[PDB]
Amino acid sequence: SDRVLQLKLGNSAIVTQEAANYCCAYGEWPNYLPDHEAVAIDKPTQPETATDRFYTLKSVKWETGSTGWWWKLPDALNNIGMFGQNVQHHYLYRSGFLIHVQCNATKFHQGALLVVAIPEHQRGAHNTNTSPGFDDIMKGEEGGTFNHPYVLDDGTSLACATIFPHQWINLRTNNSATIVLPWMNAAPMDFPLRHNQWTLAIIPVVPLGTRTTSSMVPITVSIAPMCCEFNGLRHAIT
Amino acid sequence: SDRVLQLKLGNSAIVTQEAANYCCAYGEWPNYLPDHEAVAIDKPTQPETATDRFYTLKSVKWETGSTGWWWKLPDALNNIGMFGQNVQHHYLYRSGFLIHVQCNATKFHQGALLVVAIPEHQRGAHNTNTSPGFDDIMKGEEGGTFNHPYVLDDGTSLACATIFPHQWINLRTNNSATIVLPWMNAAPMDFPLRHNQWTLAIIPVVPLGTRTTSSMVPITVSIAPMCCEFNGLRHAIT
Amino acid sequence: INFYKDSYAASASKQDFSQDPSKFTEPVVEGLKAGAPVL
Amino acid sequence: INFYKDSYAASASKQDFSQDPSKFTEPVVEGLKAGAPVL
Amino acid sequence: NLIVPSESSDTCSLIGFIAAKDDFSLRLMRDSPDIGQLDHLHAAEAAYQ
Amino acid sequence: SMMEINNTESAVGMERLKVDISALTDVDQLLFNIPLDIQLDGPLRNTLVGNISRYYTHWSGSLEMTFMFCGSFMAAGKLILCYTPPGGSCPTTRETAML
Amino acid sequence: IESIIKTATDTVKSEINAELGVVPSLNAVETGATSNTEPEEAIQTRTVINQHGVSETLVENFLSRAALVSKRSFEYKDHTSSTARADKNFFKWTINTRSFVQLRRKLELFTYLRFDAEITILTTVAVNGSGNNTYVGLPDLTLQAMFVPTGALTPEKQDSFHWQSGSNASVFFKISDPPARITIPFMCINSAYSVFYDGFAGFEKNGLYGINPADTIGNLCVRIVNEHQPVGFTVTVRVYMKPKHIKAWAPRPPRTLPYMSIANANYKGKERAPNALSAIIGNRDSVKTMPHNIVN
Amino acid sequence: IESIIKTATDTVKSEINAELGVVPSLNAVETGATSNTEPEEAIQTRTVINQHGVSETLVENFLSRAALVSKRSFEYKDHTSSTARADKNFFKWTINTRSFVQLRRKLELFTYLRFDAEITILTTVAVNGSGNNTYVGLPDLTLQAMFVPTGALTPEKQDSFHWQSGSNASVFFKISDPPARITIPFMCINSAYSVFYDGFAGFEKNGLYGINPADTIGNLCVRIVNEHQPVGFTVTVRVYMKPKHIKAWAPRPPRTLPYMSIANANYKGKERAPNALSAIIGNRDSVKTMPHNIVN
């Protein structure tokens, strides 16, 4: 019942037979911007199925010495499909997300991944007074890896990261995690190329281990923008 | 009253103070595809203001020896803005058009342009049995020029071209022409990269003439897709 | 005591006892019934 | 709080929200209808 | 194009105006940077004589 | 109020308050551009809206730019005026600005 | 039309328009009217419920801020050997709002003004330099500020009998006290002050141009009540004025060139742009040059 | 579920449970939910009427405490021979809540904050050392604190005309007076301050990371109004900020490693535990070692 789940958005569908419920961030569901909160007066474009669909990123390899991975939204999707085109052709963007993380193994494997969505994950640099640069933050589709996951790369604690919307992938229990993110920002809309509302982090708290024959164990991320809308149409930046 | 006109679509607007009414092709107005005529079952994307807006093409120079110009739709717009992006990312396309042709001169100038929208303008080649090639037909944004406007480049007559939806730009009378085109096709939707529903032709029946100081007299074309919808989302072709 | 004309000049507001811890403790679509297995 | 006997001693009066911008924006005898040509 | 006859001027002028609509609003008053002084104005001292 | 679009050297006094347009022999040519900031020095600074707004720090709402053609009666022409929302470079070609 | 406006206006959603004979984007500047084109008629808009308040741009809030109008420093000492022009433990000031440019420009944004003036007097003291080469402390002096109407008899010395103030309003205040404050009513003989006056205030032809004494609030005579100490001090008195209960008429183009004198609107301009006589706005290379272009 | 909570919840007595198919002590952490096991289901409890209040942990009470945000010491003297970098009888401070770690950490417990800021300014003065080798007394100076919005023109000297403060809010206060106090409203252009900002505040790629100027309250320019005395003093100004009318969103893991800079969240950690990069909690000998074991 709570272990099987089908997600269908646009022309895309995902089925999992080993889910563990799914998390709605702060008990909220994505929605379009209402008139009593709107600021931009131009009529927005709402592509619906053209942009509200699952985009699958490149898989990463779960290794013994893996420290963790992160992707920043909407930066990771800003050059992908019709969502990327609408982002490039518009000054203002607004949407939620539906994140589905996939990682399967055998019943002889062990391991635990914390899959956490951090709002405004302002990263810090290690052992220097210089702030992180543009290239350190904006990794796009490929994402980045945690330098010090123990402190979430920002001087805080990984132990308290459960205060953020999150799930676990415990290999003996489940093979996927699902998180629904509403619009999370101080402003009703934002310039998608210079600010990231959310950061998806996957951290191997319990390392992958087995004594059976070793196989490549990938982790795959599928993200579906939800209730997309764009304002301020102009020429493409790209 | 009938000489002034404002057209407002999306974020674009055009004002003319020397119009001559405007033509609705076959007395029809563009509309979305109804359920009782639909064929493709996937939910279409309807970008609205992102694609239903005026795109201005490159102006052409009205010369004494000018034979005429033509643009094929949607080929002329297939690489322009969000309409071009949606065309490139979708297998099926459907829309009407709003065409506004602009040409101003002085009260000492004379000249008459026939502005005609030809459905299924299947071009012919001159003095050969070989059919016209791909490069002869698909000119894109720049369009083409009539080899023999007297026969509409297809063995027919220019004199009878008034059977098609059309207006005139008579320089002593008006400086603009406006034509509204509905979806015109045997099928409810079409592959935009291999078939052109309409061909806009501007033909100088009466050549430009004056005895005042000569100036460049351009002709400018602005085309606004209307009631755009797209089906069969996939990767971009381009 | 607030004789100022701007409402933001007023003293602190310490009377909002409303809570909703479930938005952090149980942010799941399917509520978990007490006693029954979660999965 | 104004215990003075002269009314001009009172604090500022910031409650007059009435406006008439047309006396500067449209000071013409014939009002201009929206959309229709002015001349 | 700009097209004029021989007897008309070949160069024509545009005047641009800007205004705010009635959805316009302002906050956080401050001293305008458009005016300033580095010394007392003339005859300001005479007010003390 | 009048914009000082012609805020250039060799434009003295009242000349800075008008923009001269002439006949061209190439199509789709750029005529002029106007920057955005009603805070910094520019064509919008010495206007009623600009002068009053510079007494404040935060602003919101729509603006309107009205252009009056002051050529002769026999002069004819068509222009295109474009507002480009921020994010990229100022358009230098008509095919980009018209988007 | 006159109406009560508390917030910025809302926006209504709009559709495609293709109507003959209707051109809302076209206007006629020649009539002198501002264009009435609405965003709904120019582009396709959405519905926006605008809650932005407009209270901070009220004329009252715009002008009812305490601004410095006078600053006078004088020596508090034995003035037996002081020159004639020196302020001998007292000074006189003809009240005017034209000496400090911020308040002056704000007031000159209007042609006519009617308001009461809240006056705040702030005093500071320092031990004199070039006298004794030592610091001993600062006295808590008592000062008297007397309002003398324009042209009337003003005291000629610190201990003049004119300070008895039988009818003139006088305020006595200490340096240790909070700054003194009094409200002067709208005292013009007319219904409003004339911020600008295109005329001569005399029946002959030698009168001052642009100076209407009916708009001069009055005279402030400020003295130190205490007799002089064996050592000298420097006393600085600052007078701040805040208009209130304000009515304003006929707004005017703002001042652009720097002020030259408090007695007229004479102009010279800066040496080069900005705010030069031949160029108010700073120059750019050409009308096609974007000064702060975003380049990535 | 949303509800009004004024006291800690009560306990109900519970009995023996031996029910098949009911395992309240078992949970599924993988779902991301916190365990819902109640004490009644884990052990046999009694009935307890809990009267413990929860008001002291209200976010308003948690944050609405005056905390030091700025401390600046400068010389009050004749600065003719003072260097360029010295504060010549005045200073400027870009307001920020990141210089003192207690308030900074408390604020950074949240992602978004909306509040008004009560600002209290406390001034102290001392007779200068290394100048005169004597004590004479402490003057009751008058100071001016002017609020200048972020990026706007700030005074360049103690007697600069910018201090006339035609429109900027200015407060004049004496050292002998109680500390000055003013409330600054919530002035963000957004509906809430961004305590953390994962982005760049410029349209080019050279902007500052994690610094949104829309969250900068403004600039405080503080000067001594009095002209300098023949002897020098050291004046220390402390600015305390207290949030009020607070709304908070998205709590965050608390800062563990020591702060490094006010401009970023850079971390180094202590040399060894506690609060080291490789070890936050202090070490014990083993997981079977009880650090403070009771031995009798």
Return the structure tokens found at B157: 């007559």
H207 CB burial (10 A radius; 0-12, 13-18, 19+):
middle
Please name the method used to determine this structure.
cryo-EM
Class of domain B5-233: mainly beta
CA separation (Å) from G92 to G29, G118, G150, G239, G263?
52, 19, 11, 12, 18
- The reply to whether residue H189 touches residue F86, judged by beta carbons under 8 angstroms, is no
- The reply to whether residue C13 touches residue H60, judged by beta carbons under 8 angstroms, is yes
- The reply to whether residue A235 touches residue F96, judged by beta carbons under 8 angstroms, is yes
- The reply to whether residue G133 touches residue H225, judged by beta carbons under 8 angstroms, is no
- The reply to whether residue H162 touches residue E36, judged by beta carbons under 8 angstroms, is yes
Chain F neighbors of H167, CB-CB under 8 A: 55
Count interface pairs D-G at CB distance under 8 A.
79
Which of C19, C20, C23, C26 would best serve as a mutation to test chain A binding (most A beta carbons within 10 A)?
Answer: C23
Cβ of residue G23 closer than 8 Å to a chain B Cβ = yes
Chain A neighbors of H27, CB-CB under 8 A: none
Which of B1, B7, B8 would best serve as a mutation to test chain G binding (most G beta carbons within 10 A)?
Answer: B8
Closest CA to G92 of G247, G222, G207: G222
- The reply to whether residue B215 touches residue E6, judged by beta carbons under 8 angstroms, is no
Chains E and C make contact, 3+ CB pairs within 8 Å: no
Distance from the G69 Cα atom to the nearest Cα atom in chain A, whole angstroms:
41
Q: What are phi and psi of H192, to 5 degrees?
A: -155, 150
| Element housing D25 (H / E) | helix D22-25
Q: Residues B114, B65: contact at Cβ < 8 Å?
A: no
Distance from the G26 Cα atom to the nearest Cα atom in chain B, whole angstroms:
8
Chain H neighbors of G294, CB-CB under 8 A: 203-204
Among H30, H188, H266, the residue with its CB nearest the CB of A20 is H30
CA torsion angle for H288, H289, H290, H296 (degrees, to 10)?
Answer: 110
- The reply to whether residue A134 touches residue H200, judged by beta carbons under 8 angstroms, is yes
Q: Which amino acid is at B80?
A: I
Closest CA to A73 of A156, A183, A163, A219: A183
Cβ of residue A236 closer than 8 Å to a chain G Cβ = no
Chain A neighbors of H188, CB-CB under 8 A: 186
What is the dihedral sign for C-alpha H152, H154, H160, H164? positive
Return the structure tokens found at F28: 């789709």
What is the pairing mode between strands H110-127 and H180-184? antiparallel
Chains D and G make contact, 3+ CB pairs within 8 Å: yes
* DSSP track, B84-150: HHHHHHEEEEEEEEEEEEE----TT-EEEEEEEEEET-----SS-SSPP-HHHH--GGG-EE-S-GG
Chain B neighbors of G24, CB-CB under 8 A: 6
Closest CA to G21 of D36, B23, F78: D36
Cβ of residue A237 closer than 8 Å to a chain G Cβ = yes
- The reply to whether residue F55 touches residue E3, judged by beta carbons under 8 angstroms, is no
* DSSP track, F24-49: -SSSS---------SSSSSTTTTSHH
CA torsion angle for B47, B48, B50, B52 (degrees, to 10)?
Answer: 130
- The reply to whether residue D14 touches residue C5, judged by beta carbons under 8 angstroms, is yes
Chain B neighbors of A50, CB-CB under 8 A: 45, 47, 86, 89, 230, 233
- The reply to whether residue H139 touches residue G136, judged by beta carbons under 8 angstroms, is no
| Element housing H266 (H / E) | none
CA torsion angle for E14, E15, E16, E20 (degrees, to 10)?
Answer: -140
What subunits touch chain G, counting only 3 or more CB pairs under 8 A? A, B, D, E, F, H
F32: left (phi over 0), alpha (psi -120 to 50) or beta: beta
Distance from the H204 Cα atom to the nearest Cα atom in chain G, whole angstroms:
6
Minimum CA–CA partner of A19 in chain H: H31
d(CA E35, CA E19): 22
- The reply to whether residue B56 touches residue F98, judged by beta carbons under 8 angstroms, is yes
In sequence order, what are the beta bridge partners of G144? G172, G223
* DSSP track, A91-136: EEEEEEEEEEEE----TT-EEEEEEEEEET-----BS-SSPP-HHH
Count interface pairs B-E at CB distance under 8 A.
22
Cβ of residue F55 closer than 8 Å to a chain G Cβ = yes
Chain A neighbors of F86, CB-CB under 8 A: 91
Distance from the A163 Cα atom to the nearest Cα atom in chain H, whole angstroms:
6
Cβ of residue A211 closer than 8 Å to a chain G Cβ = no
Chain H neighbors of E30, CB-CB under 8 A: 148-149, 152, 167-168
d(CA G44, CA B49): 8
Please report the residues numbered 8 through 37 in chain C whose beta carbons come closer than 8 angstroms to any beta carbon of chain A.
Answer: 20, 22-24, 27-30
Domain that holds residue G146: 1-296
Instruction: Calculate ∠ Cα A7-A10-A16, nearest 5°.
Output: 20
d(CA G179, CA F8): 50
d(CA G211, CA G96): 11
What is the dihedral sign for C-alpha F2, F4, F6, F10? positive
Chains H and D make contact, 3+ CB pairs within 8 Å: no
DSSP H179: P
Distance from the G56 Cα atom to the nearest Cα atom in chain H, whole angstroms:
12
Among H152, H161, H187, the residue with its CB nearest the CB of E36 is H161
Return the structure tokens found at H110: 């949240």
Q: Residues B87, B232: contact at Cβ < 8 Å?
A: no
Q: Residues B111, B210: contact at Cβ < 8 Å?
A: no
Minimum CA–CA partner of A236 in chain B: B81
Chain B neighbors of F77, CB-CB under 8 A: 104
Peptide bond into A188 cis (omega under 30): no
Cβ of residue C38 closer than 8 Å to a chain A Cβ = yes
**Structure's resolution in angstroms:** 2.0
Return the structure tokens found at B142: 């720049």
Cβ of residue E2 closer than 8 Å to a chain G Cβ = no
d(CA B178, CA B5): 10
Longest dimension (CA), chain A: 61
Return the structure tokens found at E14: 């545009």
* DSSP track, H10-74: PB--------TT--TT---GGGSPPP---HHHHS----B----B-GGGSHHHHH-S-EEEEEEEE
Return the residue matching tokens 């031949």: G278
- The reply to whether residue B1 touches residue G19, judged by beta carbons under 8 angstroms, is no
Return the residue matching tokens 């919307």: A165
d(CA H1, CA F43): 56
Distance from the G195 Cα atom to the nearest Cα atom in chain F, whole angstroms:
18
d(CA A67, CA A64): 9
- The reply to whether residue A173 touches residue H28, judged by beta carbons under 8 angstroms, is yes
Q: Which amino acid is at G13?
A: K
What does the domain layout of chain D look like in residue ranges?
A: 1-39
Among H152, H187, H203, the residue with its CB nearest the CB of F87 is H203
In sequence order, what are the beta bridge partners of B178? B100
Distance from the G111 Cα atom to the nearest Cα atom in chain D, whole angstroms:
14
* DSSP track, B175-223: SEEEEEE----SSSSB-TTT--SEEEEEEEEEEEE-SS-----EEEEEE
Distance from the G229 Cα atom to the nearest Cα atom in chain E, whole angstroms:
25
H10 CB burial (10 A radius; 0-12, 13-18, 19+):
exposed
User: B131 CB contacts (<8 Å, ≥6 apart)?
Assistant: B125
